[PDB]
Amino acid sequence: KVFGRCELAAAMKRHGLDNYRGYSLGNWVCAAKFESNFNTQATNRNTDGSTDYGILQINSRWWCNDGRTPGSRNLCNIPCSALLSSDITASVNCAKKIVSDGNGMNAWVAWRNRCKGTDVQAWIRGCRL
Numbered sequence: 001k002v003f004g005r006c007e008l009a010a011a012m013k014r015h016g017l018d019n020y021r022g023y024s025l026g027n028w029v030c031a032a033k034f035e036s037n038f039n040t041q042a043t044n045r046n047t048d049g050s051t052d053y054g055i056l057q058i059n060s061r062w063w064c065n066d067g068r069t070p071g072s073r074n075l076c077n078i079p080c081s082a083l084l085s086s087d088i089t090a091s092v093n094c095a096k097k098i099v100s101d102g103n104g105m106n107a108w109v110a111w112r113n114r115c116k117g118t119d120v121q122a123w124i125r126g127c128r129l
Ligand SMILES: O=C(O)c1cc(N2C=C(CCO)NN2)cc(C(=O)O)n1
Pocket: 003, 004, 005, 006, 007
């Protein structure tokens, strides 16, 4: 599923991501735009052989099981395919674990490089939330 901007903002808010660990909703929408273009079916292979999955490009090196990342962990206790669903629940619940691990949203390199320190509220401007 390819979400609309406000559509994704509303889903993320409903699932408790607005201000989670202090990150306002716009930060999460910005991250998703540059990680996946709001497409839940996004995948990308990393140089180390792990793969990133879903709207927030969650990595199989640590967070999910894809059966093809030797030596990896599955800290969200989910198949990586769950992260591609039209329902963002699994991605949101896993993102909450990620952002709580100590480095906040710097875990998302695209957030650090394209969202951090920018006017992220622009990403939710005009939405009925
Ligand atoms: O493709 C776009 O740029 C786009 C698509 C959008 N939508 C909205 C929907 C309907 C939601 O139910 N689907 N794509 C919304 C926006 C935007 O708010 O800038 N932009």
